Amino acid sequence: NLMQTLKKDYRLVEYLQAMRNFFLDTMYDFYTSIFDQNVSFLNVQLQELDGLTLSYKVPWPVDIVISLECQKIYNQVFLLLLQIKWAKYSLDVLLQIHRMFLLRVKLMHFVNSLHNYIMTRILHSTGLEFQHQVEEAKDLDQLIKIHYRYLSTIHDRCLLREKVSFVKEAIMKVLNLALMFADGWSIEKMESDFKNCHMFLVTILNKAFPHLESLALS
């Protein structure tokens, strides 16, 4: 009965669908303005290096589901996602002289492949399964568990919890190559670094826990 009167009438499920939608279109125009700060400037933009804490307002009938420590995890994945959209768009908006372009495809590929992995293979696989699960909610408690078994797993597949200084930092430091090379528009000293860190990336990730092989091809 409770789940029945909770689909509408304090529609907790409807609110949940919007949550994972207003981040993870609309949010494309929002970030592009940030590329070219102030704390009030953003609000009118939204209503239209690692910060931008985002929150939301939830009514009491759904407060018990989307807890306070649940907002931060949803915020955690949003921060990291933008840095990927950043590097992906920074190397995209533009269009031994031509030798730079060979450093573009050798790089614009790699960040693009990673982005194809986090969003499609993870942020859409578990998402497609989660919706098929909540529509069979039959309990006050288990709806928390099926939900809590969606963040604590999406925070693991997207490598952000542990093994950060062992694996995650590698993707982080090579992301700085997406910033340095973007501004300049020394060249030989980039591939010596790039061919090293990229090989450092594969020769470290080679330990593969098993789902990492979906990107290990490149």
């Binding site: 009965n1 409770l2 009167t5 009438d9 309990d139 006050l140």
Partner: peptide
């Protein structure tokens, strides 16, 4: 501190009791 008489189903009680209290307020 608990009678095992109703233990094999106790979980289905609490999860029904508390869930019912949140219904009368709505």
């Amino acid at each position: 501190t608990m009678v095992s008489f109703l233990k094999p189903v106790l979980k289905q009680i609490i999860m029904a009791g508390k869930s019912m209290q949140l219904l009368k307020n709505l």
